[PDB]
Swiss-Prot record, chain A:
Domain of life of the native organism: Eukaryota
Residues represented out of the complete protein: 389 to 436 of 436
Annotated localization: Nucleus
Chain's role: Component of the origin recognition complex (ORC) that binds origins of replication. DNA-binding is ATP-dependent. The specific DNA sequences that define origins of replication have not been identified yet. ORC is required to assemble the pre-replication complex necessary to initiate DNA replication. Binds histone H3 and H4 trimethylation marks H3K9me3, H3K27me3 and H4K20me3.
Subunit structure: Component of ORC, a complex composed of at least 6 subunits: ORC1, ORC2, ORC3, ORC4, ORC5 and ORC6. ORC is regulated in a cell-cycle dependent manner. It is sequentially assembled at the exit from anaphase of mitosis and disassembled as cells enter S phase. Interacts with DBF4. Interacts with POLQ.
Family affiliation: Belongs to the ORC4 family.
The name this protein goes by in its record: Origin recognition complex subunit 4
From Swiss-Prot, chain B:
Lineage of producing organism: Eukaryota, Metazoa, Chordata, Craniata, Vertebrata
Assembly information from the UniProt record: Component of the MCM2-7 complex. The complex forms a toroidal hexameric ring with the proposed subunit order MCM2-MCM6-MCM4-MCM7-MCM3-MCM5. Component of the CMG helicase complex, a hexameric ring of related MCM2-7 subunits stabilized by CDC45 and the tetrameric GINS complex. May interact with MCM10. Interacts with TIPIN. Interacts with CDT1. Interacts with MCMBP. Interacts with DDI2.
Motif (Arginine finger): 117-120
Source organism of the structure: Homo sapiens (Human)
Domain MCM intervals: 1-142
Subcellular location: Nucleus; Chromosome
Name used for this protein in its record: DNA replication licensing factor MCM6
Residue range from the parent sequence: 412 to 782 of 821
From Swiss-Prot, chain C:
Subunit structure and binding partners: Component of the MCM2-7 complex. The complex forms a toroidal hexameric ring with the proposed subunit order MCM2-MCM6-MCM4-MCM7-MCM3-MCM5. Component of the CMG helicase complex, a hexameric ring of related MCM2-7 subunits stabilized by CDC45 and the tetrameric GINS complex. Interacts with DBF4. Interacts with KAT7. May interact with MCM10. Component of the replisome complex composed of at least DONSON, MCM2, MCM7, PCNA and TICRR. Forms a co-chaperone complex with DNAJC9 and histone H3.3-H4 heterodimers.
Protein name: DNA replication licensing factor MCM2
PTM comment, free text: Phosphorylation by the CDC7-DBF4 complex during G1/S phase is required for the initiation of DNA replication.
Positions of region (Disordered): 201-220
Remarks, miscellaneous: Early fractionation of eukaryotic MCM proteins yielded a variety of dimeric, trimeric and tetrameric complexes with unclear biological significance. Specifically a MCM467 subcomplex is shown to have in vitro helicase activity which is inhibited by the MCM2 subunit. The MCM2-7 hexamer is the proposed physiological active complex.
Subcellular location: Nucleus; Chromosome
Organism encoding this protein: Homo sapiens (Human)
Portion of the full sequence shown: 485 to 799 of 904
Curated annotation (Swiss-Prot), chain D:
Expression across tissues: Abundant in spleen, ovary, prostate, testis, and colon mucosa.
Homology family: Belongs to the ORC5 family.
Function: Component of the origin recognition complex (ORC) that binds origins of replication. DNA-binding is ATP-dependent. The specific DNA sequences that define origins of replication have not been identified yet. ORC is required to assemble the pre-replication complex necessary to initiate DNA replication.
Gene behind this protein: ORC5
Modifications after synthesis and translation: Multi-mono-ubiquitinated by OBI1; ubiquitination is important for efficient DNA replication origin site activation. Ubiquitination levels are low in mitotic and early G1-phAse cells and are induced in late G1-/early S-phase, peaking in S-phase and decrease toward the end of the cell cycle.
Coiled-coil zones: none
Protein location: Nucleus; Chromosome
Residues of the full protein shown: 219 to 435 of 435
Subunit-level organization: Component of ORC, a complex composed of at least 6 subunits: ORC1, ORC2, ORC3, ORC4, ORC5 and ORC6. ORC is regulated in a cell-cycle dependent manner. It is sequentially assembled at the exit from anaphase of mitosis and disassembled as cells enter S phase.
Name under which the protein is recorded: Origin recognition complex subunit 5
């Protein structure tokens, strides 16, 4: 609700303006998708 | 399989019982010393499951098992200092049953720091929530319950596996003179991998974990009947140390192979787009099977596409 | 294990144990060097104690959960034909030796408050069945403690970081502790020394060294002082000669200089945030003074021994 | 990068630093397999500055004026090595701990004669991650006397680094301007350059953070 004027590059408390549906369906249509990046987006981060 | 092994749970083992129990005799009236389960399974491995339903007094009495492999209990002026080379096959259990993604990796287990410091290798079961994980494991359950005593397709029976257990303890391998420079350069990699933040982090790897890695490379060539150690055998256990806290595996052995070849050419020719077969020379030398000639022929053009795009 | 030079200095001085004399006129003051070790779990602290028990003449080893108030020094009867016979523990049989106690911080609260009698007069008066009898038990307590919960935190005091009572801390002498951390300026000697001793201490290498006399694969390891080490037979005939021959006395040199020097730190410790020095560091200077003089075989104490003893207690 | 306008103004700047073998004559025409070896070390110190037109012909010029003691960094991360006064370099160091620590758990760095409870010695809490905590002036009047060696007299030039640093963009104000009865302040820059200054006047700040136990 408020954008601090004295906020730097650490205090933003922002959120997202998308959803958990169109983000997954926009991966197969994106041109040039790496193999080591697409697997990280589908999984729920199980490795280090 | 191994006859020198035990089996117990958390509440089934109290403070003693498995180490060295002491009780006054009924028909002699004298403090005797009774051996436990760790003394009968000498030069073997003890099994233990459910590491949650237990107190704290039992873990203290077993701290001298994974670091010193000996029993020193002197209770009541009765000396009973023995030794046993039995490995602990523990099996930790999460607090809430499943691994919580919100909490940290040290908040889901009950093991502290002195317990994990004296312990050697520490693996974590990989959990995958993909549609291909349950689709492949379900096929093995159907073939096992429908085809009774017919799904086993082993190439070596269990009669020859027990025979090869005594040949490993015959010719003790040595250390080659070309491996002292390779161990001093790999410990510094895990030293920086330990300190993810500044100094400390999660798993501590110091001198207790470095001496265990040398034993892994020493025992790696134990089954291959190799005298001197080789650099190709020590790097096998190096990958397990990275994945200890966790068709993609096929793409991993390709990137780690081409990086060790393109760093020694003194000159540079074409070998870019019109000479795509030049990268197949340094890899066909290790190929000596059968299916890696026709089936893997159309796979080389797919891995190289990562750089093209 | 290479490194931690300050830790190895305290282990050699505690092997002698000093000379328990009678400095008073009616009170028997004990004179034993008690060292309490406590490090971060991960630097192998118990392996440093397994070496002194093999190069000495009398040393034992016990744990925490393996003993208690019963199996300590004395505990009932002989229920067979109406008889009464007292027993003993482990500190009585270990006379004039070096005792090794493992897992001391995890000890019960009822056991830590009952061991102070054995480490104050070197004797126990058993008053059972109306029969009293005094003996002698000269021991040097060497324990290895661990921090509370996780790892050791240098941001807290040592008297509060370990789950131990306060009367037992003021009974030792050497409290040299170390903290391991990621240091790229010294990690090249740790990985180089563990791989050199891995081949020297191998059973296959002993066939041409221990079994075959007159041959050795690897010589001596490069120490941090350029001094050749000692094998095994040197340490055996070392404590059975110097400890039972020359008896250093108590002279009166420039001992008055330490009196006014103690007042400099007594009125300066609380100026920033630290506890003052008690009288324990004053009467203990004679312990390390006669320990180093026994190495060089000195009949009397010298000023060169009292100087190197202040840097150890500080 | 993705826009075409960025590569249009960047490829022109790389021409003077790539056409060196062409002018000298050591490389003939049609040779794209031998010019990537000599240019590889010349691109490792320039590809990490994307969307920044500051990288030009003035970055390497600052190194020419540093013949004596090349320890100073001017151009590439010049904010890490800057010139600070004697009593002012400790202001940014002491004020960094007053904006990420509770107003009560501060006796652990002064009076060690207290009784610690050991709360857990939780780790993924919002502490040191939500931002600078609002602190007045009573905290600065009790921490600068412990970092310095000898005593310091708070004269007129001692409190001058409180308001002069506001213009220099080193500390933020709690929204509107306060009165005079002890105003509140926050922080601005993290510990990206604090460690570089501490290693010059013999100082260690890593052992003073409360989040890193």
């Amino acid at each position: 609700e408020r954008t601090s004027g004295n906020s730097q590059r650490e205090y933003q408390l922002m959120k997202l303006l998308l959803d958990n549906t169109q983000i997954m369906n926009a991966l197969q249509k994106y041109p040039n998708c790496p193999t080591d990046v697409r697997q990280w987006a589908t999984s729920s981060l199980s490795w280090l | 399989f191994s006859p020198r092994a035990v089996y117990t749970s958390g509440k089934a083992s109290s403070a003693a019982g498995l180490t060295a129990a002491v009780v006054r005799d009924e028909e002699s009236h004298e403090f005797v010393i009774e051996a436990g389960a760790l003394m009968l399974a000498d030069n073997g491995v003890c099994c233990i499951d459910e590491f949650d339903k237990m107190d704290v007094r039992d873990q203290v009495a077993i701290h001298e098992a994974m670091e010193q492999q000996t029993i020193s209990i002197t209770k009541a002026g009765v000396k009973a200092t023995l030794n046993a080379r039995t490995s602990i096959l523990a099996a930790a259990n999460p607090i809430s049953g499943h691994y919580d993604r919100s909490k940290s990796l040290k908040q889901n287990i009950n093991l502290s720091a002195p317990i994990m410091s004296r312990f050697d290798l520490f693996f974590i079961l990989v959990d995958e929530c993909n549609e291909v994980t349950d689709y492949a494991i379900a096929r093995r359950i159907v073939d096992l319950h429908s085809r009774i005593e017919e799904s086993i397709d082993r190439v070596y029976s269990l009669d020859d596996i027990r025979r090869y257990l005594l040949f490993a303890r015959q010719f003790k391998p040595k250390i080659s003179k070309e491996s002292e420079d390779f161990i001093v350069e790999q410990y510094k990699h895990l030293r920086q991998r330990d300190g993810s933040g500044v100094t400390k982090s999660s798993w501590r790897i110091t001198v207790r974990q470095l001496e265990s890695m040398i034993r892994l490379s020493e025992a790696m060539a134990r089954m291959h009947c190799c005298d001197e150690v080789q650099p190709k055998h020590v790097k096998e256990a190096f990958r397990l140390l990275n994945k200890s806290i966790i068709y993609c595996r096929i793409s991993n052995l390709i990137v780690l192979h081409l990086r060790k070849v393109e760093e020694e050419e003194d000159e540079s020719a074409l070998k870019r787009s019109e000479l795509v077969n030049w990268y197949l020379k340094e890899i066909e030398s290790e190929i000596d099977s059968e299916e890696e000639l026709i089936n893997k022929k159309r796979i080389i053009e797919k891995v190289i596409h990562r750089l093209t795009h | 294990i290479y490194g931690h030079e300050d830790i190895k200095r305290g282990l050699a001085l505690a092997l002698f144990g000093g000379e328990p004399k009678n400095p008073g006129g009616k009170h028997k003051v004990r004179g034993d060097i008690n060292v309490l070790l406590c490090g971060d779990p991960g630097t192998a602290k118990s392996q440093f104690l397994k070496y002194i028990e093999k190069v000495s003449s009398r040393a034992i080893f016990t744990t925490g959960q393996g003993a208690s108030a019963v199996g300590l020094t004395a505990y009932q009867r002989h229920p067979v034909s109406r008889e009464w016979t007292l027993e003993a523990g482990a500190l009585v049989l270990a006379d004039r030796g070096v005792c090794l106690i493992d897992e001391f911080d995890k000890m019960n609260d009822q056991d830590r408050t009952s061991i102070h009698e054995a480490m104050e007069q070197q004797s126990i008066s058993i008053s059972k069945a109306g029969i009293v009898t005094s003996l002698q038990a000269r021991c040097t307590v060497i324990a290895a403690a661990n921090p509370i919960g996780g790892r050791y935190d240098p941001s807290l005091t040592f008297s509060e970081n370990v789950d131990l009572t306060e009367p037992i801390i003021s009974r030792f002498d050497i409290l040299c502790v170390v903290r391991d951390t990621v240091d790229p300026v010294q990690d090249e000697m740790l990985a180089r020394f563990v791989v050199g001793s891995h081949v020297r201490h191998h059973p296959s290498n002993k066939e041409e060294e221990g079994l075959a006399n007159g041959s050795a694969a690897e010589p001596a390891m490069p120490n941090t002082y350029g001094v050749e080490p000692l094998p095994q037979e040197v340490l055996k005939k070392y404590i059975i000669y110097a400890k039972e021959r020359v008896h250093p006395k108590l002279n009166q040199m420039d001992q008055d200089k330490v009196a006014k020097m103690y007042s400099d730190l007594r009125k300066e410790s609380m100026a920033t945030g630290s506890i003052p020095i008690t009288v324990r560091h004053i009467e203990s200077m004679i312990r390390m003074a006669e320990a180093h003089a026994r190495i060089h075989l000195r009949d009397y104490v010298i000023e060169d021994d009292v100087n190197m003893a202040i840097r150890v207690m500080l | 990068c993705r826009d075409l306008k960025e590569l249009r103004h960047l490829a022109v700047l790389n021409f003077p630093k790539y056409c060196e073998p062409v002018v000298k004559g050591e490389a003939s025409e049609r040779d794209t397999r031998k010019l990537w070896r000599n240019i590889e070390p010349h691109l490792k110190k320039a590809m990490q500055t994307v969307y920044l037109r500051e990288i030009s012909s003035s970055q390497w010029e600052k190194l020419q004026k540093d013949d004596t003691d090349p320890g100073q960094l001017k151009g590439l991360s010049a904010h890490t090595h800057v010139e600070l006064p004697y009593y002012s370099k400790f202001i940014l160091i002491a004020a960094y701990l007053a904006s990420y620590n509770p107003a009560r758990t501060d006796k652990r760095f002064f009076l060690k004669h207290h009784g610690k409870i050991k709360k857990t010695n939780h780790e993924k809490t919002s502490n040191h991650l939500l931002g600078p905590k609002p602190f007045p002036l009573d905290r600065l009047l009790a921490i600068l006397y412990s970092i310095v060696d000898s005593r310091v007299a708070p004269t007129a030039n001692i409190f001058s680094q409180i308001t002069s640093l506001v213009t220099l963009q080193l500390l933020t104000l709690v929204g509107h301007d306060d009165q005079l009865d002890g105003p509140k302040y926050k922080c601005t820059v993290s510990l990206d350059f604090i460690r570089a200054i501490a290693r010059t006047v013999n100082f260690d700040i890593i052992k003073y953070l409360y989040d890193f136990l």
